C-alpha cells in the first residue's frame, strides 16, 4: 500500500521526504506547521502536473477543469463562489428528505435479508445508497441502484475508477472498456442536462440544487464541455468518498462491540425508534460524530492533496527546489505516534468533548480554500445512514473477510465488507 510506504519513510526520514508518486518527483511534507503554512493560504495552489491525470484518462476527457481538477486560482474561484450557493445551511437542510428516504430504503432492503445467513456486500450496498442520494440531491434524478436499476451505469463507474488507477500507477480490453465507460458517464450528463433544460423550457419550477449552480456557472460559454466536466466531477466526488467512508466505518465497527453498544444506546436516547431524523437530531448524535471522525483518521478515502511550490523554499530545515509538487497526507499524519497516542487503536474518545482538537494533523476533507465543498453535505448523509443502521440492524463480518485497504483512485476496503445481518 503506497501510503503505508510513505508512512514508514515519514517516520524514519523526518518531516520532508522526496518520493516518486504517480510517476513524478514530489516532496512529502508532514509537520503540522508545514500543513498550516501551505494549505491555509490562497498563495499556494494545486499542481496541474499532478491533476492533469484526472483531466483526461487514456485520451478520453473526464473531469476536465471541473471544481476539483482546476488548479488555477482565479478560474477555480469563479466557479467555487457560484457553486457555493448550492451548499448553504438552508440548501443542505432541504436535503434531509432525500437523505431519510434513501437511508430508510437501504435499511428495509437489508432487513429483508436479515436472517444471519445471507452474505451481503456492505460496500456495494453503501455505494448504491450514496449514488442514489447524490443523483436525487444534486441532479433531481432517481437512479434506484438500491432497487437493482442502472446496472450498466454502475458498471461504467466501476471501470472508470479502475481506469484512473491503471493510468497513474504504471490490458487493451480494459483500455476500451475504460474509454467506453468515460463516454457513458459524459452522455448520462448530457442527458440529465437536457432533462433539466427541457423542464425549464416548458416553464416548470425546479427547486434550486447543485445542477442549477453548475449550469449557472457555465452561462456564457460556447459549449457544454465545462458543464459536463463539472457534472462528472460531482457525480463522482459526491458519492465515491462517502461510500468508501461508510464502508470503512461499518467494517471497523464489526470488531468494535463496546463502541457499537454505546452507539446503540445514544441512538436509543436521542432518536429512540423514531423513523425520520430531523436536522436538529444529527447535531445531538455526538458519539456517532466522534466514531466518524475517528473512522476518517485511520481510513481517509481521500488520503491527501498536492500544492505547487513555485520557488525554492526552506521547509523544516530542508531546501526544496522550486517547481516542486508538495505532497500532504492525512493518512500518514493520522498514523504517526508523534501526533496520535497509540495511532493504530480505533478510539473515538480522542474526539470527545474537552479533548484539544487536532492541530493540522487531521484533514480528511483537506484544509483552506481548496477543502471539500461537500463536507457538511457528507457529514449529514453518513450520520443519517449510520444512525438508521444502528437503530435496526446488527452486522457480522463474514469469516475470511479482511480488514485491509487497497489504493484505487481513493482508499477503500480490500474486501467488499461481506456481512450477515440480524434485526436488533
271 binds ligand CL6 (CB under 6 A): no
Residue 220 makes CB contacts below 8 A (sequence gap 6+) with none
Least distance (Å) between residue 211 CB and ligand HEM: 12
Does an H or E element contain 309, and which? strand 304-309
Out of 227, 372, 389, 417, name the contact with ligand HEM by CB under 6 A. 372
Least distance (Å) between residue 83 CB and ligand CL6: 14
> Up-side HSE of residue 146: CA atoms within 13 Å toward CB?
22
The one segment of 255-263, 298-306, 346-354, 390-398 that binds ligand HEM by CB under 6 A? 298-306
Out of 7, 103, 378, 409, name the contact with ligand HEM by CB under 6 A. 378
Beta bridge partners of 421: 395
Taking the least distance from each CB to ligand HEM, the nearer of 31 and 305 is 305
241 binds ligand HEM (CB under 6 A): yes
How far apart, in Å, are the Cα atoms of 369 and each of 143, 150, 206, 290, 344?
Answer: 32, 35, 30, 25, 30
Hey, which bits of 246-392 come out as E strands? 304-309, 313-315, 318-320, 324-329
Give the annotated binding-site residues.
372
- Residue 367: how many CB atoms within 10 A of its CB? 18
69 binds ligand CL6 (CB under 6 A): yes
| Tally of helices (H runs) and strands (E runs) in the chain | 17, 13
Least distance (Å) between residue 287 CB and ligand CL6: 26
54 binds ligand CL6 (CB under 6 A): yes
The β-bridge relationship of strands 318-320 and 313-315 is antiparallel
Residues that contact ligand HEM, how many (by CB under 6 A): 21
Does an H or E element contain 421, and which? strand 418-423
Taking the least distance from each CB to ligand CL6, the nearer of 57 and 288 is 57
329 binds ligand CL6 (CB under 6 A): no
364 binds ligand HEM (CB under 6 A): yes
Q: Give the whole-angstrom CA distance, residue 244 versus residue 409.
A: 11
Taking the least distance from each CB to ligand CL6, the nearer of 362 and 395 is 362
* Cell reading at 105: 430504503
Q: Give the whole-angstrom CA distance, residue 104 versus residue 46.
A: 39
CA angle 251, 405, 17 (to 5 degrees): 135
Q: Give the whole-angstrom CA distance, residue 375 versus residue 373.
A: 6
Least distance (Å) between residue 164 CB and ligand CL6: 5
Give the annotated binding-site residues for heme.
372
237 binds ligand HEM (CB under 6 A): yes
Out of 245, 350, 388, 392, name the contact with ligand HEM by CB under 6 A. 245
Q: Which positions from 55 through 94 interact with ligand HEM, judged by CB under 6 A?
A: 67-68, 80
Q: Give the whole-angstrom CA distance, residue 22 versus residue 19.
A: 10
Least distance (Å) between residue 68 CB and ligand CL6: 4
Residue 388: exposure state from Cβ atoms within 10 A (0-12, 13-18, ≥19): buried
Q: Which of 32, 92, 73 is nearest to 375 (CA)?
A: 92
DSSP 8-state assignment for residue 413: E
The one segment of 7-15, 21-29, 217-225, 238-246 that binds ligand HEM by CB under 6 A? 238-246
String marking each residue 120-159 x if it binds ligand HEM according to CB under 6 A: ----------------------------------------
Out of 365, 388, 409, 421, name the contact with ligand HEM by CB under 6 A. 365
Q: Give the whole-angstrom CA distance, residue 188 versus residue 227.
A: 12
409 binds ligand CL6 (CB under 6 A): yes
Alpha helices in 112-219 (DSSP H): 122-139, 151-168, 172-201, 210-216
189 binds ligand HEM (CB under 6 A): no
Question: Where does this chain bind ligand CL6 (CB under 6 A)?
Answer: 54, 63, 66, 68-69, 161, 164, 233, 236-237, 240-241, 302, 409-410
The binding site for ligand HEM (CB under 6 A) comprises 67-68, 80, 234, 237-238, 241-242, 245, 301-302, 305, 364-366, 370, 372-374, 377-378
Amino acid at each position: 500500500v503506497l501510503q503505508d510506504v510513505f508512512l514508514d519513510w515519514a517516520k524514519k526520514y523526518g518531516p520532508v521526504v522526496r518520493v516518486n508518486v504517480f510517476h513524478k518527483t514530489s516532496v512529502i511534507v508532514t509537520s503540522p506547521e508545514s500543513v498550516k503554512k501551505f494549505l491555509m493560504s490562497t498563495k499556494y495552489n494545486k499542481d496541474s502536473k499532478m491533476y492533469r491525470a484526472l483531466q483526461t484518462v487514456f485520451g478520453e476527457r473526464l473531469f476536465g477543469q471541473g471544481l476539483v481538477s482546476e488548479c488555477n486560482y482565479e478560474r477555480w474561484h469563479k466557479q467555487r463562489r457560484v457553486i457555493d450557493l448550492a451548499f448553504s445551511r438552508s440548501s443542505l437542510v432541504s436535503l434531509m428528505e432525500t437523505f431519510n428516504e434513501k437511508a430508510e430504503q437501504l435499511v428495509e432492503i437489508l432487513e429483508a435479508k436479515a436472517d444471519g445467513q445471507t452474505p451481503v456486500s456492505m460496500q456495494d450496498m453503501l455505494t448504491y445508497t450514496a449514488m442514489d442520494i447524490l443523483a436525487k440531491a444534486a441532479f433531481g434524478m432517481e437512479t434506484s441502484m438500491l432497487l437493482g436499476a442502472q446496472k450498466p451505469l454502475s458498471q461504467a463507474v466501476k471501470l472508470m475508477l479502475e481506469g484512473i488507477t491503471a493510468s497513474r500507477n504504471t490490458k487493451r480490453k480494459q483500455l476500451r472498456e475504460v474509454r467506453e465507460s468515460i463516454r457513458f458517464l459524459r452522455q448520462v450528463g448530457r442527458d440529465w442536462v437536457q432533462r433539466r433544460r427541457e423542464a425549464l423550457k416548458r416553464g416548470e419550477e425546479v427547486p434550486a440544487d447543485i445542477l442549477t449552480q453548475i449550469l449557472k456557472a457555465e452561462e456564457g460559454a460556447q459549449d457544454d464541455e465545462g458543464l459536463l466536466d463539472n457534472f462528472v466531477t460531482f457525480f463522482i466526488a459526491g458519492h465515491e468518498t462517502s461510500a468508501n467512508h461508510l464502508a470503512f466505518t461499518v467494517m471497523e465497527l464489526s470488531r468494535q462491540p463496546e463502541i457499537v453498544a454505546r452507539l446503540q444506546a445514544e441512538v436509543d436516547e436521542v432518536i429512540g425508534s423514531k423513523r425520520y431524523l430531523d436536522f436538529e437530531d444529527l447535531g445531538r448524535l455526538q458519539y456517532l460524530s466522534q466514531v466518524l471522525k475517528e473512522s476518517l483518521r485511520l481510513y481517509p478515502p481521500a488520503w491527501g492533496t498536492f500544492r505547487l511550490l513555485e520557488e525554492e523554499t526552506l521547509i523544516d530545515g530542508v531546501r526544496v527546489p522550486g517547481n516542486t509538487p508538495l505532497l500532504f497526507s492525512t493518512y500518514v499524519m493520522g498514523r504517526m505516534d508523534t501526533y496520535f497516542e497509540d495511532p493504530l487503536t480505533f478510539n473515538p474518545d480522542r474526539f470527545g468533548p474537552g479533548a484539544p482538537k487536532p492541530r493540522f494533523t487531521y484533514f480528511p476533507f483537506s484544509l483552506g480554500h481548496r477543502s471539500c465543498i461537500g463536507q457538511q453535505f457528507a457529514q449529514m448523509e453518513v450520520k443519517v445512514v449510520m444512525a438508521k443502521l444502528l437503530q435496526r440492524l446488527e452486522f457480522r463480518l463474514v469469516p475470511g473477510q479482511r480488514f485491509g485497504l487497497q489504493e484505487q483512485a481513493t482508499l477503500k476496503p480490500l474486501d467488499p465488507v461481506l456481512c450477515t445481518l440480524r434485526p436488533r
